[PDB]
RNA sequence: GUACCGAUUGAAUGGCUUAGUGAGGCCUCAGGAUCUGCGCGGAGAAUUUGGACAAACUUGGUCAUUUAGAGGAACUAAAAGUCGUAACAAGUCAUUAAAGAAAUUUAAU
RNA sequence: AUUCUUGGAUUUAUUGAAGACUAACUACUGCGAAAGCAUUUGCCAAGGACGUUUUCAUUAAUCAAGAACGAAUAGGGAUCGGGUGGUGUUUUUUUAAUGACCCACU
């Protein structure tokens, strides 16, 4: 039905990282991230930039042919939080308003 | 989802067409001037009048688009003619109801430009039909209204291919102008799969392109390329009156990002700046109007390097201009483009480090302007001087090995040279400015008392001050004796990049970090005027000798006289 | 302003034999000039999927498939089979409280030399009508159960490559058979595999790798 | 910064020139890394005595000018810098047909 | 704020190297005289309870000086190990059986 991808949502603390791959892992596009779309170096993982950011990577994404996409969420992992971040509740909910499909998620922490 | 109709200049809209999920990514104009449809990545087609009447819809196959045109009696995309896909595959249908005529497929490869350009007869008694835009290779259709078709030839001449052109009589026997994604625009012709002559200027990928209104060999023909047009004659081979294909002008524009600027004209007329872009733009300051149509030379830009420009300079007539880049040399160009091997005077070799500022002596008629005083990030700088013949001519070793002035660590970021051939004064990155002299290269002075590394020094050419700019928000001011520290200005909200005096001695003119320009005065050591129309960094500066226009650098393209 | 996803090579994954449908996905690689032509630059991409996506049985939606690039045609490329994986939702499941985890570890070679460590996990179950609220081991039935894995594991593995014990690791044929020998000693609880991952490709080897394709 | 006096004739160039220095090819007595051919020649590198022709290079002095110019006397610039002193000024709605699946187009009243 | 960064930082996929430790299970449970003791496997001895119709025959106990090692009254419920019994079950479409379990006794 579409062409498929990995969406690999590492949501970090003071930084949320988003950046679709293709269905190997090798290759990547639209690496853009949540840090990038405000400048006060205190709001990165404010989740109204991470809506801003998800919406910049689901536009590329869009424009070169990827519609659906897996999402991997991952915190910072091994001897830190293990935790989901602030941008990752709205930023998952940001790209798939964009008009891509979600589907069949998992989770990437390194849990040691 | 925006695809907006228009009407006559004003520009307002008539209606707004986003009824379709897919993203609309191609449109064209039609030959009865009053229809539109656009292609999309859904393969979804709509055909729409403007007053406004958006009729039957036509779905009968998926993929995505990116190329089409239009006929007379079959008035749609590659939907209808062909079929614009992403696999390959001709498509027959009518301008009759969605009934499928006949299908043709023969392609492996993506190509979506499978009627780029028609064929206007469509019996083809000695015609052809031209297609390809993704799939690197050029294949000739026939044309059948009832029964299946056949390939005439297929070209695997090109290796990559986005757009084609055809002749407007159809026969082929004249000029077909080819655009593919190789850099590369060639003319071939149809009945014998030969080329005529192939075209090499650029070092990006051709855009697509569109039709001229023109019959058979043009008159004149225009080349999409990045912030940049040219103009080509039209014989590219012996058809008319020339051959070994030459490029009539090159009309430029101007780039977003900006690093330096320096007035080339000895009236004050041309303006060359230094880009991303590895070429040599002379545009702004005689055009008042958009694009260049009114510099009183041949119109063209240049290309001696293979990476970015870091800093460009000229003299005072304008005939010698030294330019600084990425790959390690020094290219000089000349006034009136010419010269004995392209239009480059000499190209000098012997950096080992990245070549990021440069520099003239003063003008006399010849000699020093003959001259170059460069510099590179090899914490030297170096000076080109062989007299006995006419310099900036030929290719010149003198200070390469124990010649030149090494006593820095970090980088020198500019150097400046007086109004006499003495000292020259360059500002480095590690704090401090320092004189040596020209005619020998000896240390002469040490001047510093700063915060952060000087990125601009430049001299008052009545010889009594100096003016440097550093990171700690401070213009500092220094005396022709170097026994006592002369003015040090504050008032810059951010740091200064670039300082300069006016050529009647009376303003210093400061561009920096803040979002504006400010024109302190070098007599009372006050604040005559600020300016501000800017919100983005100023890099570059120039004066010319009146006082009234200045030019600013920022960081979007825009040139501000005041 | 390049803008490479004008240039850049489309293309699709075929996979091999004893599965459901060989139509998998998409990749973009490369456009194909000479001096870094496509074919012979990647050759070893790793595709990570979900078999159950490709089965079409729902219940396998855990025990994720890794697979190996060998060859490339011409919009087709066949890959092969690297390792197996478990999600980490799926055995974070299963450690319960109040009962005792028995793992075990086996370097074993098939018929056709590939050298393959796969893991093991075991756990124990509470009988019908246990009164008490652990059922443990005896530390020395650890041993008899550690030992009963072993002996079996190096068994199935050298026989008929591995695409056969591919067949056999999807229905987990080879839990029952850990299942019904080590039952006399303690009963058990879930056992699966939960890794297999390979060192030791011997050769490039066309010759069997087109026997499995249609 | 410009015009002038004046020591150094310093550096550049021009006139004259003491002094030392000297490329290059020509011939001939000797020589052989090397060549297709019914006893061996066309061709050919180094080295070599003598003889004719020979451009020209380096530096010192006399004189002029520029530059550098100690020192000596002006003009202009800087309204400039400090201090003292003086007076003025200044707050197309509805019902309803036709095409169109939907919008929309057109007619009717 | 410090730091790194177009000779590409951070993220991504593939490897190799170095050091370190056994994550949920892990308990008011076990072991050791104490300080202490958590990956598999092999070897080397040491130890306790239980069982014993084997054996010595007062061989005992407690503690200045001193040494090794370490900074330097009588019930109840649950649990660990061993043994005994079973109008007992379960694994047994395999004949047996080891083994887990149910209950009593110590």
């Not at chain 1, 919406?55 to 996409?69: L, N, P, R, S």
């Not at chain 2, 993506?110 to 008694?125: S, T, Y």
């Not at chain 2, 880049?325 to 020094?330: E, M, P, R």
């Amino acid at each position: 039905s579409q062409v498929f991808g990995v969406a690999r949502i590492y949501a970090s603390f003071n930084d949320t990282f988003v950046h679709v791959t293709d269905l190997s892992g090798k290759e990547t596009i639209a690496r853009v991230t949540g840090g990038m779309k405000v400048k006060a170096d205190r709001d990165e993982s404010s989740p109204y930039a991470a809506m801003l950011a998800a919406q910049d990577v689901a536009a590329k994404c869009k424009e070169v042919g990827i519609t659906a996409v897996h999402v991997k969420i991952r915190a910072t992992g091994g001897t830190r939080t293990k935790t989901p971040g602030p941008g990752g509740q709205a930023a998952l909910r940001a790209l798939a308003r964009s008009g891509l499909r979600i589907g069949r998620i998992e989770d990437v922490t390194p849990v040691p | 989802q925006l695809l907006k109709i228009f009407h006559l200049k004003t520009g307002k809209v008539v209606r707004s067409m986003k009824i379709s999920s897919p993203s609309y990514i191609l449109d064209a104009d039609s030959t009865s001037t009053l229809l539109a449809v656009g292609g999309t990545d859904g393969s979804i087609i709509v055909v729409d009048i403007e007053n406004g009447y958006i009729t039957h819809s036509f779905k009968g196959h998926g993929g995505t688009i990116s190329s089409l045109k239009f006929y007379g009696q079959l008035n749609s995309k590659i939907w209808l003619l062909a079929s614009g896909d992403t696999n390959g595959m001709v498509k027959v249908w009518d301008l009759v109801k969605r009934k499928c005529l006949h299908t043709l497929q023969e392609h492996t490869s993506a190509v979506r430009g499978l009627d780029i350009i028609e064929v206007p007869d469509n019996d083809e008694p000695s015609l052809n039909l031209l297609s390809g835009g993704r799939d690197d290779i050029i294949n000739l259709w026939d044309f059948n209204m009832k029964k299946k078709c056949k390939l005439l030839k297929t070209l695997p001449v090109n290796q990559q291919v986005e757009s084609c052109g055809f002749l407007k009589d159809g026969d082929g026997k004249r000029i077909i102008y080819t655009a593919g994604g190789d850099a590369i625009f060639q003319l071939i012709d149809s009945e014998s799969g030969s080329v005529l002559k192939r075209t090499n200027k650029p070092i990006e990928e051709l855009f697509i392109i569109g039709v001229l209104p023109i019959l058979s060999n043009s008159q004149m023909f225009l080349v999409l390329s990045d912030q940049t047009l040219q103009l080509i004659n039209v014989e590219e081979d012996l058809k008319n009156d020339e051959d070994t294909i030459q490029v009539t002008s090159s009309i430029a524009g101007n780039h977003g990002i900006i690093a330096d600027m320096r007035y080339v004209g000895p009236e004050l007329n041309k303006l060359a700046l230094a880009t991303n872009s590895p070429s040599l733009r002379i545009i702004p300051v005689p055009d008042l109007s958009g694009p260049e149509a009114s510099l009183p030379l041949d119109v063209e830009i240049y290309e001696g390097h293979e990476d970015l420009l870091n800093s460009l300079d000229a003299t005072e007539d304008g005939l010698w201009i030294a330019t600084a880049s990425k790959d390690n040399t020094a290219i000089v160009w000349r006034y009136n483009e010419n010269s004995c091997k392209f239009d480059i005077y000499a190209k000098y070799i012997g950096h080992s480090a990245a070549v990021t500022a440069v520099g003239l002596p003063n003008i006399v008629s010849k000699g020093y302007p003959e001259f170059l005083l460069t510099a590179s990030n090899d914490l030297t700088i170096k000076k080109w001087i062989i007299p006995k013949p006419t310099a900036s001519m030929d290719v010149q070793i003198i200070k390469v090995s124990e010649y030149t002035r090494h006593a820095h660590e970090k980088d020198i970021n500019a150097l400046s040279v007086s109004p006499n051939d003495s000292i020259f004064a360059t500002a480095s990155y590690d704090k401090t400015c320092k004189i040596w002299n020209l005619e020998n290269g000896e240390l002469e002075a040490t001047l510093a008392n700063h915060k952060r590394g000087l990125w601009d020094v430049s001299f008052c050419q009545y010889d009594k001050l100096l003016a440097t700019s550093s990171g700690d928000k401070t213009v500092k001011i220094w005396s022709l004796d170097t026994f006592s520290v002369m003015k040090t200005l504050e008032g810059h909200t951010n740091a200064v990049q670039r300082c300069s005096f006016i050529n009647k001695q009376k303003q210093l003119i400061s561009c920096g970090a803040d979002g504006l320009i400010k024109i302190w005065d070098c007599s009372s050591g006050e604040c005559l005027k600020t300016l501000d129309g800017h919100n983005n960094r100023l890099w570059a500066l120039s004066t010319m000798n009146d006082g009234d226009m200045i030019v600013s650098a920022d960081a979007d393209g825009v040139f501000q006289f005041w | 302003v390049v803008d490479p996803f004008t240039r850049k090579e489309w293309f699709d994954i075929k996979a091999p034999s004893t599965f459901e449908n060989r139509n998998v996905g998409k990749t973009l690689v490369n456009k194909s000039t000479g001096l870094k032509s496509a074919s012979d630059a990647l050759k070893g991409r790793v595709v990570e999927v979900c078999l159950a996506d490709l089965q079409g049985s729902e219940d396998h939606s855990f025990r994720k498939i890794k697979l190996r690039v060998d060859e490339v045609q011409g919009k087709n490329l066949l890959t092969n089979f690297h390792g197996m994986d478990f999600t980490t939702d799926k055995l974070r499941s299963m450690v319960r409280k109040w009962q005792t985890l028995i793992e075990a570890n086996v370097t074993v070679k098939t018929s056709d030399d590939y050298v393959l460590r796969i893991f093991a996990i075991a756990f124990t179950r509470k009988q019908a009508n246990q009164v008490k609220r652990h059922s443990y081991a005896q530390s020395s039935h650890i041993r008899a159960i550690r030992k009963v894995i072993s002996e079996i594991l190096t068994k199935e593995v050298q026989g008929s490559t591995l695409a056969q014990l591919t067949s056999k690791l999807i229905p987990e044929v080879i839990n029952k058979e850990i299942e019904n020998a080590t039952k006399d000693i303690f009963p058990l609880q879930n056992i699966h595999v939960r890794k297999v991952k390979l060192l030791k490709q011997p050769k490039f080897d066309v010759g069997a790798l087109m026997a499995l394709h249609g």
